[PDB]
């Protein structure tokens, strides 16, 4: 199906407090498998998935040698960006980089991306054609010229369309028990009495993977999303996800309300009804 490999990098300067905090994480779909933290002791790429630890020492040596290069590039970038924006030397600033590739149902390249942000604001991004850049302001345009001169986009295209896809396919094959699975959500409905004339009807979906799911409340068929307390899909901690949607029902109207659960793991959308 659509699968994806993504790498996230965060570099936070700590002025007068030590080296910048560098954190790198790697995801296949909604599953973290690699991590690096400058404040950890290993100073190595650590595994976060059972399918990745069986890689040899060469894999981890290469991953650590590349993540330290990323760390050194981001440390230089912190000062370069502090210079471009004429910011003071005593403020902590954040740099974020996210790059990866999505492959389709045929496990062939579908989309590549490489985004770069400064202080939570878009800075420079690779366009969908993997040839041009989108800059946010004039410092980002300066970077765009520096990167067009160095032919950065061509090397990035070679990586995203080739190496990224190949290693994503390797991961999908080696970790199919967790990566190619579809855990259908376990659903149930709860009913709480907020008063004697009102009640809360909550609809739960637990233990599902991947995280994409739709919970919709309906009253006699009409949509109730404006009066629906929906929470962000949250991790359970075991590689699955949770979600719930609540509605305030007048006491005696519970049979009018139906919860609808749509997930990739469900052959038919589940329709839950209280009473």
């Amino acid at each position: 199906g659509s699968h994806s490999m993504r790498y996230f990098f965060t570099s936070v300067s700590r002025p007068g407090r030590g080296e910048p905090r560098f954190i790198a994480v790697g995801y296949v779909d909604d599953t973290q498998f690699v991590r690096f933290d400058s404040d950890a002791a290993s100073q190595r790429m650590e595994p976060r998935a059972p399918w990745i630890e069986q890689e040899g020492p060469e894999y981890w040596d290469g991953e650590t040698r590349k993540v330290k290069a990323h760390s050194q590039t981001h440390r230089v970038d912190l000062g370069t960006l502090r210079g471009y924006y004429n910011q003071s030397e005593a403020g902590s600033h954040t740099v974020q980089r996210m790059y990866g590739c999505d492959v389709g149902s045929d496990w062939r390249f579908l989309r590549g991306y490489h985004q770069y942000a400064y202080d939570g604001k878009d800075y420079i991004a690779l366009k969908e054609d993997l040839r041009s850049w989108t800059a946010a302001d004039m410092a980002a345009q300066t970077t765009k010229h520096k990167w067009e001169a160095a032919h950065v986009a061509e090397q990035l295209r070679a990586y995203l369309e080739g190496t990224c896809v190949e290693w994503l396919r390797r991961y999908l094959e080696n970790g199919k028990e967790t990566l190619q699975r579809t855990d259908a959500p376990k659903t149930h409905m709860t009913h709480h009495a907020v008063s004697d004339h009102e009640a809360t009807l909550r609809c739960w979906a637990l233990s599902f993977y991947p995280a994409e799911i739709t919970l919709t409340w309906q009253r006699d068929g009409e949509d109730q999303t404006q009066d629906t307390e929906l929470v962000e899909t949250r991790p359970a901690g075991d590689g699955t996800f949770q979600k719930w949607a609540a509605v305030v029902v007048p006491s005696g109207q519970e049979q009018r309300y139906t919860c609808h659960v749509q997930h990739e793991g469900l052959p038919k959308p589940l329709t839950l009804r209280w009473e």
Binding site: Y7, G26, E63, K66, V67, A69, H70, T73, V76, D77, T80, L81, Y84, Y99, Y116, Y123, I124, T143, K146, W147, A150, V152, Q155, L156, Y159, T163, C164, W167
Partner: peptide, 9 residues
């Protein structure tokens, strides 16, 4: 697998 080459801003 991360990108071997990383250029700077």
């Amino acid at each position: 697998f991360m990108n071997k080459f990383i250029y700077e801003i």
